[PDB]
C-alpha cells in the first residue's frame, strides 16, 4: 500500500492509499524552547514537532517550515516528514511508495528539493508529486469542474474539463487561513485583546475555527451587528479568561471576498474564480459553472457556499444555474483524492521509480508530474 502525504501549510494530512480518511492530521509546526532550562533531564528535547509542540506551546517559539505552499525551512521540514513516517504513521518509508502534493505555480526548486529529500534521505522506493487541485476532483468523483482550493497557505482555482486541465486558466492567490488568522489578531486588537506570541497566534487560529462565519450580505450584516446584541459570541482562553467577539466574526472571513482588508490588490475568491472560467475556451464554461468543487479547510466557514453561490450568480450570465459543490468532508478532500489516485491500477505506471531518479537526478520530477 502506498503512502499519501498532503504536505499542507497548516496541517500535514497523511495515511495509506485506499483508506477513506487520513491516519495522521497534525500541525505543520516545529517548536524550539525559548526559556532557561533549569531542571536536569525531565524528558526535555532540543525541539518538538506537531502535536507535542502544540501541547507544550506555552514554552516554545513555534514556526511553520511552509509559507504559501513553499518549503522555506528544509531542516525543520525533514523533521516533519521524519515525524510523520516514524512517529505518527509508524512505518519505514524505505518499503512504501509515497504520493506527495503541492499547489500550482510553486518554484521548480521547491519540487526538486522535495523529491531529492524523499529519495536521497528517506530512500522511498517510488514517489509522485500531484497538483493538489487535481486530487480534489478525484475525491468528488468528477471529470469536469473548477476546483476552488483554499488551505492555510494558498488559494487556487484549476478548471478541468473531461480530465484535461486548462493550465493557462489556473489562478493562484497567496491568501488563506494563515492570513485570515493574522488579520483576526489585527482586528481583535480593536476590541481590546492583545495576541502576539506565536503560541497566542494559535489561540486566535482556534477562535477562527469555532466562532467565525461568512456574512451572506456583508454591509447588511455590519448594519445588523452595529445595532444588536444577538450577533456576539464568547470564547474561553486557555487561561479561563472569557473574551467576547461581534462584527469581528464575519469581517475576518470576508477578507476572502475583499482582499483589500489585508492591503492586497487582488480581486476576491468569487472574482478570481469567475476570471478563471472566463479565461477558459467558451464551450466548457456551462459545465464549469455547474461544477464549482470547493476544497481545503478555509472553505469550512458556515455560509461560504451560500455567499460564493450568491456572488458567482451575480457575475455569471443569468440563463444558467451555478452550483457550488461543498462536500461535508471537503476539509480532507485533497488527501481523500490522493488516497484514490495512489490506488488506481491505471496510475501505478506513473510513479517516479528510484531507478529514474538515480539516472536523471531531481529534474526527473518535471518530466513525470504535472
Amino acid at each position: 500500500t502506498a503512502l499519501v502525504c498532503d504536505n499542507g501549510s497548516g496541517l500535514v494530512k497523511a495515511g495509506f492509499a485506499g483508506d477513506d480518511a487520513p491516519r495522521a492530521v497534525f500541525p505543520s509546526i516545529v517548536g524550539r524552547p525559548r526559556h532557561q532550562g533549569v531542571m536536569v533531564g525531565m524528558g526535555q528535547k532540543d525541539s518538538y514537532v506537531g502535536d507535542e509542540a502544540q501541547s507544550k506551546r506555552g514554552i516554545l517559539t513555534l514556526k511553520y517550515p511552509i509559507e504559501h505552499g513553499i518549503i522555506t525551512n528544509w531542516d525543520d521540514m525533514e523533521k516533519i516528514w521524519h515525524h510523520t513516517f516514524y512517529n505518527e504513521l509508524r512505518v519505514a518509508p524505505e518499503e512504501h511508495p509515497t504520493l506527495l502534493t503541492e499547489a500550482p505555480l510553486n518554484p521548480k526548486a521547491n519540487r526538486e528539493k522535495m523529491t531529492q529529500i524523499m529519495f536521497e534521505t528517506f530512500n522511498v522506493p517510488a514517489m509522485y508529486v500531484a497538483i493538489q487541485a487535481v486530487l480534489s476532483l478525484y475525491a468528488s468523483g468528477r471529470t469536469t469542474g473548477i476546483v476552488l482550493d483554499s488551505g492555510d497557505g494558498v488559494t487556487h482555482n484549476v478548471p478541468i474539463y473531461e480530465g484535461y486541465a486548462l493550465p493557462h486558466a489556473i489562478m493562484r492567490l497567496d491568501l488563506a487561513g494563515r492570513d485570515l488568522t493574522d488579520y483576526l489578531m489585527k482586528i481583535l486588537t480593536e476590541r481590546g485583546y492583545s495576541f502576539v506570541t506565536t503560541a497566542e497566534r494559535e489561540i486566535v487560529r482556534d477562535i477562527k475555527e469555532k466562532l467565525c462565519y461568512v456574512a451572506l450580505d456583508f454591509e447588511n450584516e455590519m448594519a445588523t451587528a452595529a445595532s444588536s446584541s444577538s450577533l456576539e459570541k464568547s470564547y474561553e482562553l486557555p487561561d479561563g479568561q472569557v473574551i467576547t467577539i461581534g462584527n469581528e466574526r464575519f469581517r475576518c472571513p470576508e477578507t476572502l471576498f475583499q482582499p483589500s482588508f489585508i492591503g492586497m490588490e487582488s480581486a476576491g475568491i468569487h472574482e478570481t474564480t469567475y476570471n478563471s472560467i472566463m479565461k477558459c475556451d467558451i464551450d466548457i464554461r456551462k459545465d464549469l459553472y455547474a461544477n464549482n468543487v470547493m476544497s481545503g479547510g478555509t472553505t469550512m466557514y458556515p455560509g461560504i457556499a451560500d455567499r460564493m453561490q450568491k456572488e458567482i450568480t451575480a457575475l455569471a450570465p443569468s440563463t444558467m444555474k451555478i452550483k457550488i459543490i461543498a462536500p461535508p468532508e471537503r476539509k480532507y478532500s485533497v488527501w481523500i483524492g490522493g488516497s484514490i489516485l495512489a490506488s488506481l491500477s491505471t496510475f501505478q505506471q506513473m510513479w517516479i521509480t528510484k531507478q529514474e531518479y538515480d539516472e536523471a537526478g531531481p529534474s526527473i520530477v518535471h518530466r513525470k508530474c504535472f
Binding site: 454591509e219 455590519m222 448594519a223 452595529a226 445595532s227
Partner: protein, 187 residues
C-alpha cells in the same frame, strides 16, 4: 401660469414638512437630516434623507443637518435634500408646479439667491415663492379659508427647533420694522 396644486415645503431646522396646497395635512413630516458617506464617482448618489436617514447611522453614514438656526448653511446637502424630496417623496415634476418655500425673517439675501438659483437652474421649477415663515403661521389660526373667518391683525410667535421669532402683522401687512428674532428654540 400652470394650474397644478402648488407644492409646499417648510424646511425647518428640526423637521421638513412637505405637501401640496389644499390638502388637510402635510404629505410628510420628517427630520431635516441627510445621511452621506464619511470605478465611477457615486458618493453624491448614495445619500438618504428624513426618517429613512436615521436608519443609516449604524450602516456607517454620517448624518448632518443642513439647516441650522433656521437658515440653510450647507448648500451641497440642501440641494441633494431637495432633489430627493422632489423626486422620491413628493414624486413630482418641477417644470409643472409652483413651489412655496419658507425661511425666517432675518435670513441673508445670499440664502434667497442660492435658493432661487437651485430651484430655477438645477430643478427648473415653473415658479417660486419664498415666504417669511411666521407671516404664514397667522393663516393657520382661522376657522376656515373663507373671508368672514379671517382675522388679519395679530402678533405671531413662532418657535421651531432652531429659531424663535415674533412677527406683528396688522390688516394683512407685516410690520417689518418691529420683527424680533432669537436663534434659541427646540434644539
Amino acid at each position: 401660469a400652470s394650474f397644478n396644486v402648488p407644492i409646499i415645503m417648510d424646511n425647518g431646522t428640526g423637521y421638513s414638512k412637505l405637501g401640496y396646497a389644499g390638502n388637510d395635512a402635510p404629505s410628510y413630516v420628517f427630520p431635516t437630516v441627510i445621511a452621506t458617506r464619511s470605478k465611477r464617482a457615486t458618493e453624491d448618489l448614495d445619500f438618504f434623507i428624513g426618517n429613512d436617514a436615521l436608519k443609516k447611522a449604524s450602516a456607517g453614514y454620517s448624518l448632518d443637518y443642513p439647516i441650522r438656526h433656521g437658515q440653510i448653511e450647507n448648500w451641497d446637502h440642501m440641494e441633494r435634500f431637495w432633489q430627493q424630496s422632489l423626486f422620491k417623496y413628493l414624486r413630482c415634476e418641477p417644470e409643472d408646479h409652483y413651489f412655496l418655500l419658507t425661511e425666517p425673517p432675518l435670513n441673508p439675501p445670499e440664502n434667497r439667491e442660492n435658493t432661487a438659483e437651485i430651484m430655477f437652474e438645477s430643478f427648473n421649477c415653473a415658479g417660486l415663492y419664498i415666504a417669511v415663515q411666521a407671516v404664514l403661521a397667522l393663516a393657520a389660526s382661522w376657522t376656515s379659508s373663507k373671508v368672514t373667518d379671517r382675522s388679519l391683525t395679530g402678533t405671531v410667535v413662532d418657535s421651531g427647533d432652531g429659531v424663535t421669532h415674533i412677527i406683528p402683522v396688522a390688516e394683512g401687512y407685516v410690520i417689518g420694522s418691529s420683527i424680533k428674532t432669537m436663534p434659541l428654540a427646540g434644539r
